[PDB]
Design a binder for this molecule. Structure first.
Ligand SMILES: *[C@@H]1O[C@H](CO)[C@@H](O)[C@H](O)[C@H]1NC(C)=O
Ligand SMILES: *[C@@H]1O[C@H](CO)[C@@H](O)[C@H](O)[C@H]1NC(C)=O
Ligand SMILES: *[C@@H]1O[C@H](CO)[C@@H](O)[C@H](O)[C@H]1NC(C)=O
Ligand SMILES: *[C@@H]1O[C@H](CO)[C@@H](O)[C@H](O)[C@H]1NC(C)=O
Ligand SMILES: [Cl-]
Length: 376
């Protein structure tokens, strides 16, 4: 069986922080730590009041001079477990079910004969950033793939979930075809938001606390806006009509041609600068140039557009279309477009009724992967 590299999505691996801060927002926040501690995922950091400490540490600061993000003063954030699987199997190091992410899939791989940290490895990254600020990650990924090829005697299968697919596409678009033909066996793409997702507009405008309802959407919006990866995944015109309205309010409409106005009108001008920084990273039409298995969920109501009676500080009414709950179905047309643009095969596989996160632990998904890895 071929070596496997796992690429997670947004929120999809642990992050650790170390502190020596000049000031804190509440007295109950730690100023200084002697070592790194887990900043994602630890449920105790997300409780009311304490969550302000977490926001103050996990937010990114956008520097308009350098056009780059930086950590807050006296904060360092690192990504543990590169080359291992623990930090993407369990988001919470307590190993609570709330953070079980790639664990079910890795249990299956190991049952099929894989070895954690050897012929199956994770490629975790700082998912708050877009690929323009993760150069060193891509160098390490290239090196890890080459090492796995040399150690285990053949090309690697990349398995990516959600935003990890856009990270993987960026990487592959930038490697020579001869490198890909030698080192990459196949790319199994699970729930890829090719062309962005509509729900990013609601996140940026009014916040999304759906997974932390005891905290205010306007409070969590602070962190969500600060993550460059959010603005990177706003809808693109190679998937969506430039005239489709994503956000309606009593006085104005916003389409994907209206992002500059949108960012001005929600009071977050840095988001426009982030979008400018990131909108050109992934080449609109260029296929990955490897054997591709595109697995996409359908039959789950997926946010398509939003109507605000009061904008932007109140929750909107939601209009739903088809997809997997998060990724709009029209992302799949991107893979379909790649069929005629690359020589390597592109296989499309619909997963009816498969929700965005559940697809990672779903028996049908795992049976498909087994066929890719172990053969007929
Ligand atoms: C912004 O980045 C510039 C250029 O690197 C640097 O000189 C400046 O100190 C940064 N600003 C802050 C507040 O760190
Ligand atoms: C498509 O979007 C890009 C930015 O993402 C923009 O530069 C380009 O003009 C758009 N093309 C259209 C509307 O034809
Ligand atoms: C936005 O467009 C909708 C139709 O898509 C229209 O009915 C509405 O009047 C428009 N709103 C504004 C503020 O122009
Ligand atoms: C798993 O995915 C299959 C294929 O899409 C779907 O029919 C099934 O309902 C899913 N299982 C669960 C528990 O959702
Ligand atoms: Cl092929």
């Amino acid at each position: 069986h071929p070596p496997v590299v796992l690429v997670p999505g947004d929120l999809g691996n642990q992050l650790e922080a170390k502190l020596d801060k000049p000031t804190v927002v509440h007295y109950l926040c730690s100023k200084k730590t002697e070592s790194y501690f887990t900043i994602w995922l630890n449920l105790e950091l997300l409780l009311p009041v304490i969550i302000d400490c977490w926001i103050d540490n996990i937010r990114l600061v956008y520097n308009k001079t350098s056009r780059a993000t930086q950590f807050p003063d006296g904060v360092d954030v690192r990504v543990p477990g590169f080359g291992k699987t623990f930090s993407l199997e369990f988001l919470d190091p307590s190993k609570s079910s709330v953070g079980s992410y790639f664990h079910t899939m890795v249990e299956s791989l190991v049952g099929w004969g894989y070895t954690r940290g050897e012929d199956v490895r994770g490629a975790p990254y700082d998912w708050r950033r877009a690929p323009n600020e993760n150069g060193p990650y891509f160098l390490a990924l290239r090196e890890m793939i080459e090492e796995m090829y040399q150690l285990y005697g053949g090309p690697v299968v990349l398995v990516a979930h959600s935003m990890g697919n856009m990270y993987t596409l960026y990487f592959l678009q930038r490697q020579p075809q001869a490198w890909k033909d030698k080192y990459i066996r196949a790319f199994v793409s699970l729930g890829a938001p090719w062309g962005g997702v509509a729900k990013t507009l609601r996140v940026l405008a009014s916040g999304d606390n759906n997974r932390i309802p005891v905290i205010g959407p306007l409070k969590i919006r602070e962190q969500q806006r600060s993550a460059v990866s959010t603005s990177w995944l706003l809808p693109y015109n190679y998937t969506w009509s430039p005239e489709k309205v994503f956000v309606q309010t009593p006085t104005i409409n916003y389409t994907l041609r209206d992002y500059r106005k949108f960012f001005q009108d929600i009071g977050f001008e840095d988001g426009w600068l982030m979008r400018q920084d990131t909108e050109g990273l992934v080449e609109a039409t260029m296929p990955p140039g490897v054997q591709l298995h595109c697995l996409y969920g359908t039959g789950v109501p997926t946010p398509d557009s939003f109507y605000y009676e009061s904008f932007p500080d109140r929750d909107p009414k939601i209009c739903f279309g088809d997809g997997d709950g998060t990724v709009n179905l029209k992302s799949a047309l991107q893979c379909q477009a790649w069929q005629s643009r690359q020589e390597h095969q592109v296989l499309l596989q619909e997963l009816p009724g498969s929700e965005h996160i559940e697809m990672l632990a779903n028996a049908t998904t795992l049976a498909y992967l087994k066929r890719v890895l172990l053969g007929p």
